[PDB]
Amino acid sequence: QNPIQKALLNGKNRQDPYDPFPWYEKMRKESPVYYDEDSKVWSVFLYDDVKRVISDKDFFSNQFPFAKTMLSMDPPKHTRIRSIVSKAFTPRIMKEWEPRIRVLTDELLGKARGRDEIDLVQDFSYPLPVMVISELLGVPSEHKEKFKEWSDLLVSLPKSAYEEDVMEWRTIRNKGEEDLSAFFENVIEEKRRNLGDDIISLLIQAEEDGDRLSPDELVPFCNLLLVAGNETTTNLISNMVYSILEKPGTFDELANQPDLIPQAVEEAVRFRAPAPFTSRIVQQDTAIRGVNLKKGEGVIAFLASANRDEAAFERAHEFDIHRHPNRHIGFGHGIHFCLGAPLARLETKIALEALLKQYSAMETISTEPMANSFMYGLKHFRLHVKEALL
Numbered sequence: 001q002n003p004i005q006k007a008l009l010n011g012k013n014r015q016d017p018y019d020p021f022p023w024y025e026k027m028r029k030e031s032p033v034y035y036d037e038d039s040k041v042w043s044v045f046l047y048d049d050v051k052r053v054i055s056d057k058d059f060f061s062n063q064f065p066f067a068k069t070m071l072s073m074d075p076p077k078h079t080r081i082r083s084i085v086s087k088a089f090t091p092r093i094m095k096e097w098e099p100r101i102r103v104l105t106d107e108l109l110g111k112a113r114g115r116d117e118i119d120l121v122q123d124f125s126y127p128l129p130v131m132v133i134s135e136l137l138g139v140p141s142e143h144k145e146k147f148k149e150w151s152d153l154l155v156s157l158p159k160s161a162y163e164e165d166v167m168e169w170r171t172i173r174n175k176g177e178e179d180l181s182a183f184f185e186n187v188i189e190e191k192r193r194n195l196g197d198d199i200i201s202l203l204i205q206a207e208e209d210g211d212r213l214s215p216d217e218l219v220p221f222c223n224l225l226l227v228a229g230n231e232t233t234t235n236l237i238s239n240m241v242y243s244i245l246e247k248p249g250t251f252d253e254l255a256n257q258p259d260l261i262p263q264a265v266e267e268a269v270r271f272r273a274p275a276p277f278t279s280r281i282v283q284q285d286t287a288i289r290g291v292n293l294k295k296g297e298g299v300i301a302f303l304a305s306a307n308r309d310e311a312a313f314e315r316a317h318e319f320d321i322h323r324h325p326n327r328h329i330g331f332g333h334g335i336h337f338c339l340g341a342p343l344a345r346l347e348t349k350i351a352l353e354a355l356l357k358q359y360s361a362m363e364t365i366s367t368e369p370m371a372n373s374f375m376y377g378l379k380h381f382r383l384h385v386k387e388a389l390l
């Protein structure tokens with residue numbers, strides 16, 4: 001009964017979970033502005049139209065009939081909520097974490113030492129972002145396995161459009177949401193008279209010291225930062241290593257000149273971002289490519305398709321660490337531009353620097369994709385590895 005969910009189940013989610021890209025190409029070329037008659041929802045595939053839908057707030061609203069987070073809010077309230085944490089997520093504040101993120105990354109590859117096969121996701125790309133986001137928020141990272149279980153549910157989709165699968169899915173997801181929410185409620189209660197140098201303390205101060213934040217928006221805020229904080233960066237690390245190993249010689253280029261890694265992270269955000277789409281609702285009649293959109297019509301904006309648009313990028317289908325002019329919209333565009341982009345850039349850089357120093361070779365054995373998800377990425381990534389001579 002969620003039209004956006006139905007539209008994903010009718011389109012995106014009918015494609016290979018780790019290879020939606022031929023489908024995006026087909027839509028770009030044949031139906032770049034597509035009405036799903038079943039769901040009553042538009043999809044846009046081309047760079048200029050996706051970029052406009054996500055940024056043109058005069059016409060495209062974030063607020064539908066996580067619901068109580070900045071993600072689902074329009075100005076003026078959006079500006080006040082985002083400003084609570086805007087300063088805390090700046091490149092310069094996240095730079096203070098580079099030492100701690102290096103240590104966490106080191107410790108994980110430490111524990112992998114002496115193994116000829118690793119599960120990148122279980123051993124590395126899941127634990128590091130869950131641990132960093134736990135320490136930033138101010139919760140114990142010893143809960144990472146439960147955090148991962150809850151996060152995977154909160155970004156999941158039913159296995160099909162079939163009412164029984166949707167109901168089964170609603171039950172399990174709702175239970176995840178209840179238990180994660182109870183968790184944060186317990187954390188808040190504890191932190192109110194034991195504040196830390198941490199983001200949950202910042203939120204509590206905003207709710208307690210004035211009316212910047214409602215009591216019913218603390219736990220939503222926690223859920224959003226916990227879940228985004230790991231589901232995005234986990235899948236961006238995994239997807240980036242996969243992108244590198246897919247293109248022979250890329251591994252050795254980056255290892256031989258690690259100053260390229262920041263560019264290669266931007267290329268991984270263009271090429272295999274963890275967030276392939278976002279959604280808007282039309283709040284004012286408009287047109288894209290002469291197609292008329294009416295107030296109240298939902299729109300899915302395929303960032304992943306925009307970032308592969310032949311019209312916007314040369315060799316858009318190629319992973320090119322040397323992309324000189326890359327103006328990807330993989331973090332979004334305009335007022336909802338990813339709050340975590342600096343953290344994500346910093347974690348992914350450090351993750352990849354570590355892997356390229358630790359391993360002189362890595363080869364894919366198997367993967368299990370994130371199927372039935374809002375996210376694009378890997379549940380498992382088994383690799384044969386050879387540790388470098390030091």
Ligand code: HEM
Nearest residue numbers: 070071228229232233236275278331332336338339340344
């Ligand atoms: C790792 C790669 C990441 C990608 C590709 C990514 C992508 C996105 C995109 C496209 C948006 C815009 C959504 C929209 O316009 O509707 C967004 C928003 C956001 N992301 Fe990220 N994200 C990443 C990492 C993170 C991290 C690590 C966190 C938390 C630390 C985070 C927290 C957020 C929040 C809170 C918003 C909402 C901003 C707002 O509504 O004003 N993201 N992200």
Ligand SMILES: [Ca+2]
Nearest residue numbers: 063064072073
């Ligand atoms: Ca709203």
Ligand SMILES: [Ca+2]
Nearest residue numbers: 207208210211
């Ligand atoms: Ca208050």
